[PDB]
Amino acid sequence: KLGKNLLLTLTVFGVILGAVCGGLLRLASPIHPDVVMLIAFPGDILMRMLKMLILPLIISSLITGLSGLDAKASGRLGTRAMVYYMSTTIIAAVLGVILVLAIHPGNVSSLDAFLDLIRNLFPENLVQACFQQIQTVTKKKGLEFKDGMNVLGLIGFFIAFGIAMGKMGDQAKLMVDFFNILNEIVMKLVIMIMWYSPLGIACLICGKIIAIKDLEVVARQLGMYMVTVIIGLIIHGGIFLPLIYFVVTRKNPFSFFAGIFQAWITALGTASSAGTLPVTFRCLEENLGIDKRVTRFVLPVGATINMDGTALYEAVAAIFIAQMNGVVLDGGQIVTVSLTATLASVGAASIPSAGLVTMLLILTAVGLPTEDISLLVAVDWLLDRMRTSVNVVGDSFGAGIVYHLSKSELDTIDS
Amino acid sequence: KLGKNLLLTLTVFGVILGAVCGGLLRLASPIHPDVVMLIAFPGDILMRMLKMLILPLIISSLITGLSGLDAKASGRLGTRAMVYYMSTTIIAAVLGVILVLAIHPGNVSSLDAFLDLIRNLFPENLVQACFQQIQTVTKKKGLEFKDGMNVLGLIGFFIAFGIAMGKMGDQAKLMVDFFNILNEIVMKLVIMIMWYSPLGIACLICGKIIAIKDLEVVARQLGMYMVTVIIGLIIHGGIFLPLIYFVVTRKNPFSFFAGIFQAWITALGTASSAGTLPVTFRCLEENLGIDKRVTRFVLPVGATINMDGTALYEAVAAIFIAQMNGVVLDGGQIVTVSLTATLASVGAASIPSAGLVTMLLILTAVGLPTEDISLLVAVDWLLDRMRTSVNVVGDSFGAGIVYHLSKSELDTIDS
Amino acid sequence: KLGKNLLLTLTVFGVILGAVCGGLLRLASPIHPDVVMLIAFPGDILMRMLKMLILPLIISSLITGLSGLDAKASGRLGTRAMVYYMSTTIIAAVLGVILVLAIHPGNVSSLDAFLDLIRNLFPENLVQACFQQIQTVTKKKGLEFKDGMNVLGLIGFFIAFGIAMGKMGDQAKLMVDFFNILNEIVMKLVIMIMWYSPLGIACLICGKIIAIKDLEVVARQLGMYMVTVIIGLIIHGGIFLPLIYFVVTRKNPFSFFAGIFQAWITALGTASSAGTLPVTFRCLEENLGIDKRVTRFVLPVGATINMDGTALYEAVAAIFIAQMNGVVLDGGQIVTVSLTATLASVGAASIPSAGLVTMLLILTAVGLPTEDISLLVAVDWLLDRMRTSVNVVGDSFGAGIVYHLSKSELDTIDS
Numbered sequence A, B, C: 001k002l003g004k005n006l007l008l009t010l011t012v013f014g015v016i017l018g019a020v021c022g023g024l025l026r027l028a029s030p031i032h033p034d035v036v037m038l039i040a041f042p043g044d045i046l047m048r049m050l051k052m053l054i055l056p057l058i059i060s061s062l063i064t065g066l067s068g069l070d071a072k073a074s075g076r077l078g079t080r081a082m083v084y085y086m087s088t089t090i091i092a093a094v095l096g097v098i099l100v101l102a103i104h105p106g107n108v109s110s111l112d113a114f115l116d117l118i119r120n121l122f123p124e125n126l127v128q129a130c131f132q133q134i135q136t137v138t139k140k141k142g143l144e145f146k147d148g149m150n151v152l153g154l155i156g157f158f159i160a161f162g163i164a165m166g167k168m169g170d171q172a173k174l175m176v177d178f179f180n181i182l183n184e185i186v187m188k189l190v191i192m193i194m195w196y197s198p199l200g201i202a203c204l205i206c207g208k209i210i211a212i213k214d215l216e217v218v219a220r221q222l223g224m225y226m227v228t229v230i231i232g233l234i235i236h237g238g239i240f241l242p243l244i245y246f247v248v249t250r251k252n253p254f255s256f257f258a259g260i261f262q263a264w265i266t267a268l269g270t271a272s273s274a275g276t277l278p279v280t281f282r283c284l285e286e287n288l289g290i291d292k293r294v295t296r297f298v299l300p301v302g303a304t305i306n307m308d309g310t311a312l313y314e315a316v317a318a319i320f321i322a323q324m325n326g327v328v329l330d331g332g333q334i335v336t337v338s339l340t341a342t343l344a345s346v347g348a349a350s351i352p353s354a355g356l357v358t359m360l361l362i363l364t365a366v367g368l369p370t371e372d373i374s375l376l377v378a379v380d381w382l383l384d385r386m387r388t389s390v391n392v393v394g395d396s397f398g399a400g401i402v403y404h405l406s407k408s409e410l411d412t413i414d415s
C-alpha cells in the first residue's frame, strides 16, 4: 500500500502540507491580504478549471445515460427499479434539508419565489440559460437577470431531449455515438485535472485556514455538521428503509437485515459501492434465496444510479456552506438544492469520496461561494466509509422489494 | 366527428371554459392583480416553453430544408418556381404591412434606423446574436446592446450555411443526417407542448379578458382588424395574382379561374393546403390541359413553401398587436416584420390555423409583448378557411405561369 | 498577367479608387461626419462580416489540425520539428513586441494584471467566454465583466480538446469527419467574403483618409513603422537563426547560407511560402546533401505551420495600431498579443499578404479598434516580399538542425 493509489498519497501529502503551512503562517503575523490571495490562487485556478467542465459534462452524460442505456430492459423490473430509485433519493434529500434547517449550524414574497422557480425551470432562450438566471425585483415588480448559471433549465430541457431521442429508436444512431464520443473526451479532461488536484487542494486549505480569524468556533460548527450528517444517515438507514420494506412486503425487516448485516461490515471497510458487489451477490442470492433473474438487473445498476447517502451528505453540505457565510436561503432555492441533490447523486458514483466532485454542481446551482469546499475535505476521511454502507443498504432493500413485488411475475414467466 | 380531432375538441373546451370564466370573474369584482397573474400563469408557462423551441427549430429546419431537398430538381422549373414563390410572398407581405399602416387600427433618425438594420443583419459575434441586438443610442451617438433575440442575423448566417453545404455535394453526408435527426427530435418536442396547449390557452384567455378594462373598444378594433385582413386578402387574391398572370402570359385570367373556381369551394371547405391536392390535381391536369411533367414538381412543393395568405394574415397580426400596446414602430423594425413574414410563411404549412404557431417567431423578432396572442385566437375560426383559399390560388396561378413559361422547353425536351 | 489573379487586379483598382476619392474629398470641404460614416459603411460591413467567422473558424481549424494530422509521424522527427517550430515563432514574437515598444512609433497593478491574465486563460463558464472577458476593477477590488471576446480561453480549452481527441485513437471517427466538414464549409464562406473584399477595402480607405485630420504626421509614423518591421526582420533573420544553428550544430552558418542564398532570391521574387518548395527541394537535397528521409517531413509542413516573418510583422502591426489611438497597453495584454501572434502565425499561410486576414484575430483579442487596418494595407506591397524570405529561411535552418540532430538516428535506422 506504499505506492498503490498514488493520488490518495498525494492528496494526503497536500492536506498535511497545507495544514502545517497554515499552522506556521497563522502564528506568523497578521498577513497582508493580497499575498494571502496569491497563496490561495492555485485553489482558485482549480475551482475555475473545474467549473469549466460542467456544461459539456451535463450535456454529454444526460444523453449518453438516458437514451442508449434504457434500451429494452425488462418491462416491469425496469420501471419498478426506477420508481424505487428515484423515490428513496428524493426522500433522503428532503430529510437532509429538513435536518440541516432544524439543527441550524453555522452561527420578495415566498409565492413570488416559487413562481421564480417555475419560471427558471422552463428557460426562455437557451443560450441565455447557460449563464443567466431570471429573478424578480421590486419597483410594479418586473423581472430581470441575475448572473450565475441556470442548471435546472438545462437539466429539464436535456432530459426532455434524451427521452425524445429514446422514443425515436434505431433511426438516431448518428447522434448517440457522437455524444458518447463527447462524454469520453470530457471524462479524460476531468482525469487530467483530478491528477492536478492535490496542489490545488493544499493552497485552498492554506487560503481558508489563514484568513479564518478564529480557530475554535469553526471547529465547533464542523463538529455540529458531522453530528447532523451522522444523525441524518442513521435515521434514514435505520427507520425509513425498513419501514418502506415493512409496509409493502409485510415481512420482518431484521430477517432481511441479517445477511446485509454481515455484508455491511466490508461495506464500511472498503468505502466503495463497486467494491462490495462480489460480496453482496453471495450474500443476497444465497442467504435470502433471491432469484438470479432479478438481481443481475437490480444490483449493478443500483450500485451506480442509487446512492441515498451521497444525496444526504451532499444536500446537507450545501446548506452548511450557505449558512457559514450568512447567506440565508428562501424557498426559491431550497427546492433547487433538494432537486439537484437528486440529480447530482445519480451521477458521480462507485468510488470513495465522490461527494467532493459532484458538489460543484450544486455549489453553482444555488449561487454560492464555491471556494469554501475545503472545510469539507478535512472532515471526510471519517464520513465516507459509513455513507457507503447506506449506499449498499439502499440497493439491498430494493433488491428485496422488487423481488417481492415481482415473484408472481417471475413464477408466471416460468410456466 | 365526436372523438376525431381530439386536440380541436380540447381547444374548443378550453376557449369556452376560459370565456365563461372571464365572464364570471369580470362581473365578480375589481380583482387583486397578483391573483390575476397567478390565474394567467399557465399561459405564461406555455409562451416561455414555446420560445424555448425556436432556436433549435430555426437552426434545424433551415439546414434540413435547404441542403438535402434542393438536390437536383429540373434546371429551369426549380428556379422559375422559386422566383415566383419568393416573389408573391414578399409582395403579399408588403401589401399587408401597407394596409395595416393605412387603416390604422388599435387606437433617432430613420437613416440611423436603417443602418441599425444593416448592422443587425450581419452579426458581429455569433453567440452575442442568440440573445442580444445592437441598437444606436444618443449622446456622439455610440452603439450598445438591447436585450431580445436577433432573428435576422441567425437566419442570414444559417441560410449562407445551408447554401454553402449544398454546393459541397456528396462529401457532407455526416452533417445533413445529423441535422435531420435534430429536426425530428425538436419536432417531437413541439408535438408534446402542442398536446399541453389548451390548458395554456384557456388561462391566457382568462388573463387577457379579466385585466382588459373595457368590453367594447377591444371588440371594435378586433372587428377593424378582421376588416383589414379580409380587404387585404381580397385585393391580393383578386387583383395582384391575375395581373401577374395577364402581364406575362397575355391570356384571359377568368378562363383559368373557372377550374380553380370549382376547386376553391372545397378549398374554403376543408381549410388545408394539404387536403386540396387530390382535388386540384384533377382540376388542373384535366380542366386546363396542364402538362403532367410540371404539375408534379410545382404543386406539392407549392402547397408547402408558398402560402401568401399566411404571410398576409401574419404580417397584419403582428403590427396589430404592436399598435394595441401603443408601441409605435419605425423603419428599423418594419423591414424586420416584412422579412420575417416571408421567412415565417414558408415554414409552418399544410394545416388549419398554423398562423398561431409561427407567429411566435415574429413576436420575438420585433421585440413585442408575446403574451397577447389570445386576442387573435378567438377570431380565427372564421379567418383561416378563406386564407387557405388564397393559399390554393397562389399555387394554381404559378402552375399556370411556369407551364406557359416552359411550354417551349417541354416541347424541345420532347423531341 | 492581364486577367490572371483577378482578385489582385480588383484590390488594386479598389485601393486606387479609394485613394483618388480621398484625394478629391479631402480637398473638397470640411465634411459632415455622418456622410463620412455613410461612405465608410461598406468597410464596417466587411469588418463585422469577417468577425462573424472567427468563432467557427478557430473551433473547426483547431480540431481539424491537431487530431487527424499528427497521426503517427516519425517518433523523433515530429517532436524535434515541433519544438523548433514553436520555439522560433515565440522568440520572433517577443522580439517584435520588444522592438515596437522600444522604437515607440505612434506619437490597477501589474501583478493584478497578470492574475487577470491567468484567470482569463481558464474560463469559468464556456458560453460566457465567447463574448465576455473577466477584468478587475477598484473599490475591495472585485471582479466584473467587460465586453469583448475571450480568445485565450477558447484556444486553451479547444487545444486541450484536440489533444484529448488525439489520444483516443480509432474510436473517434464520427467527430473528426464532422469537424472537417465544418472547416470546409467555413472556408468556403470565407472565400465568398474575400471575393466581396475590394469594395470594402476601398470604402474603408476613404473613411480613414477623409477623417484623418493630417496628411503628414501619419506618413511619418508609417515610415517609422516600416523601419521597425524591417529592422526586426533583419535582426531576426540575420542574427537569431544562425546563432541557433551555430550553438547546437557547431558548424559554419554561411556555408549553409550559400544554397539558401540562391533560393532566397526567388523567395523574395514570388512572395509565397508555397511557391518556393520546388526550388528549395533542389537547393536543399542537392547543394547540402541533406537526407531525403527528413526533408519530405520537415519542409512541406514547415512551409505551413512555421512562419516567423508573419509573427514578427503581425505582432508589430498590432501594437502599432494600439499606439495610434492612444490606447496604451499593460502586461495583462502584452502577453495576449505575444501569444496570439504565435497562434495566429501558424494558421494563415502559403499565400502572399496573408497577414491582413489573420490580423483580425489579434485585433479582437486585445480589444482594439478593428476598423483601422487600412493604414497597413497601403504599405504592404513592399513588405510581404521580404517577409516570405524569412519564412523560407526559418524552414531551411530547421531542415539543417533536425538533420544534424538525427543523423545518428538515420544511420542507426539504416543498419
Ligand SMILES: CCCCCCCCCCCCCCCCCC(=O)OC[C@H](COP(=O)(O)O)OC(=O)CCCCCCCCCCCCCCCCC
Residues within 6 Å of the ligand: A050, A053, A054, A057, A058, A061, A062, A065, A066, A069, A070, A086, A159, A300, A301, A304, A305, A343, A344, A346, A347, A348, A357, A358, A359, A360, A361
Ligand atoms: C465536476 C462536475 C461534476 C458534475 C456531476 C455531473 C454528473 C451527472 C449529473 C447529471 C445526472 C444525469 C446523468 C445521467 C445518469 C448518470 C450517467 C450514467 O452513467 O447512468 C448509468 C445508467 C446506466 O448504467 P450503465 O448501463 O452501467 O451505464 O443510466 C440509467 O439507466 C439511469 C439514468 C437516469 C438519468 C437521471 C434521471 C434523473 C431524473 C429522474 C426523472 C426521470 C424522468 C421522469 C419523466 C417525467 C415523469 C414521467
Ligand SMILES: CCCCCCCCCCCCCCCCCC(=O)OC[C@H](COP(=O)(O)O)OC(=O)CCCCCCCCCCCCCCCCC
Residues within 6 Å of the ligand: B050, B053, B054, B057, B058, B061, B062, B065, B066, B069, B070, B086, B159, B300, B301, B304, B305, B343, B344, B346, B347, B348, B357, B358, B359, B360, B361
Ligand atoms: C413555434 C416556433 C415556430 C417557428 C416557425 C419556424 C419554421 C421555419 C422558419 C424558417 C423558414 C426556413 C425553413 C426551411 C424551409 C421550410 C422547411 C421545409 O420543410 O422546406 C420544404 C422544401 C422541400 O419540401 P419537401 O421536399 O416536401 O420537404 O424546402 C425547399 O425546397 C425550399 C426551402 C426554402 C428555404 C427558405 C428560403 C427563404 C429565403 C429566400 C432566399 C433564398 C436564397 C437567396 C440567395 C440570394 C440570392 C442569390
Ligand SMILES: CCCCCCCCCCCCCCCCCC(=O)OC[C@H](COP(=O)(O)O)OC(=O)CCCCCCCCCCCCCCCCC
Residues within 6 Å of the ligand: C050, C053, C054, C057, C058, C061, C062, C065, C066, C069, C070, C086, C159, C300, C301, C304, C305, C343, C344, C346, C347, C348, C357, C358, C359, C360, C361
Ligand atoms: C479571418 C479570421 C482569421 C483567423 C485565423 C485563424 C487561423 C487558425 C488559428 C488557430 C491556429 C491553430 C489552427 C490549427 C493549426 C493550423 C491548421 C492546419 O492546417 O495545420 C496544418 C498541420 C498539418 O498540415 P497538413 O497535413 O499539411 O494539413 O497541422 C499540424 O500538424 C500542426 C498543428 C499545430 C496546432 C497549433 C499549435 C499551437 C500551440 C502550441 C502548443 C502545442 C501543445 C502544447 C501542449 C503543452 C506542452 C506539453
Ligand SMILES: COc1ccc2[nH]c(=O)c([C@H](c3nnnn3CCc3ccccc3)N3CCN(C4CCCCC4)CC3)cc2c1
Residues within 6 Å of the ligand: A005, A006, A007, A061, A187, A190, A191, A194, A195, A347, A348, A351, A354, A357, A358
Ligand atoms: C460521470 O461524471 C463523473 C464525475 C466525477 C468523477 N470522479 C472520478 O474520480 C472518476 C475516475 C477518476 N478520475 N480521476 N481519478 N479517477 C480514479 C483515480 C485514479 C486515476 C488514474 C490512475 C490511478 C487512480 N475515473 C477514472 C478511472 N476510474 C477507474 C474506475 C474503477 C475504480 C477507480 C479507477 C474510474 C473513473 C470519474 C468521474 C466521472
Ligand SMILES: COc1ccc2[nH]c(=O)c([C@H](c3nnnn3CCc3ccccc3)N3CCN(C4CCCCC4)CC3)cc2c1
Residues within 6 Å of the ligand: B005, B006, B007, B061, B187, B190, B191, B194, B195, B347, B348, B351, B354, B357, B358
Ligand atoms: C416545421 O416546423 C413546424 C412549426 C409548427 C407545427 N405545428 C403542428 O401542429 C405540426 C403537426 C402537429 N403538431 N401538433 N399536433 N399536430 C397535428 C395535430 C395532431 C397530433 C397528434 C394526434 C392527432 C392530431 N405535426 C404533427 C402531425 N401532423 C400530422 C401531419 C398530417 C396532418 C395532421 C397530422 C403533422 C405535423 C407540425 C409543425 C412543424
Ligand SMILES: COc1ccc2[nH]c(=O)c([C@H](c3nnnn3CCc3ccccc3)N3CCN(C4CCCCC4)CC3)cc2c1
Residues within 6 Å of the ligand: C005, C006, C007, C061, C187, C190, C191, C194, C195, C347, C348, C351, C354, C357, C358
Ligand atoms: C485556415 O484559415 C484560413 C485563414 C485565411 C485564408 N485566406 C485566403 O485567401 C485563402 C484562399 C483564398 N481565399 N480567398 N481567395 N483565396 C485565393 C485567391 C483566389 C480565390 C478564387 C479564384 C482565384 C484566386 N483559399 C482559396 C484557394 N486558394 C488556393 C490555394 C493555392 C494558392 C491560391 C489558390 C487557397 C485557399 C484561405 C484562408 C484560410
Ligand SMILES: CC(C)CCC[C@@H](C)[C@H]1CC[C@H]2[C@@H]3CC=C4C[C@@H](O)CC[C@]4(C)[C@H]3CC[C@]12C
Residues within 6 Å of the ligand: A005, A007, A008, A011, A194, A197, A201, A351, A352, A353, A356, A357, A373, A377
Ligand atoms: C473538490 C475537489 C478538490 C476534488 C477533491 C480532490 C480530491 C480529494 C479527490 C478528487 C478525486 C478523488 C480520488 C478519485 C479516485 C480515487 C481512487 C480510489 O481508489 C481511492 C480514492 C481516490 C484517490 C479519490 C480520493 C479523493 C480525490 C483525490
Ligand SMILES: CC(C)CCC[C@@H](C)[C@H]1CC[C@H]2[C@@H]3CC=C4C[C@@H](O)CC[C@]4(C)[C@H]3CC[C@]12C
Residues within 6 Å of the ligand: B005, B007, B008, B011, B046, B194, B197, B198, B200, B201, B351, B352, B353, B356, B357, B373, B377
Ligand atoms: C397560440 C398558441 C397557444 C398556439 C395555439 C394553440 C392551439 C389553439 C393550436 C396549436 C396547434 C393547433 C392544432 C394543430 C393540429 C390540428 C389538427 C387539425 O386536423 C385540426 C386543427 C388542429 C387541432 C389545430 C387546432 C389549433 C391548435 C390546437
Ligand SMILES: CC(C)CCC[C@@H](C)[C@H]1CC[C@H]2[C@@H]3CC=C4C[C@@H](O)CC[C@]4(C)[C@H]3CC[C@]12C
Residues within 6 Å of the ligand: C005, C007, C008, C011, C194, C197, C200, C201, C351, C352, C353, C356, C357, C373, C377
Ligand atoms: C483587411 C481585409 C480587407 C483583408 C485585406 C483585403 C485584401 C487586400 C486581401 C484579402 C485576401 C488577399 C488575397 C488572397 C489571395 C491572393 C492570391 C495570391 O496569388 C495573390 C494575393 C492575393 C490576391 C491576396 C491579395 C490581398 C488580399 C486580396
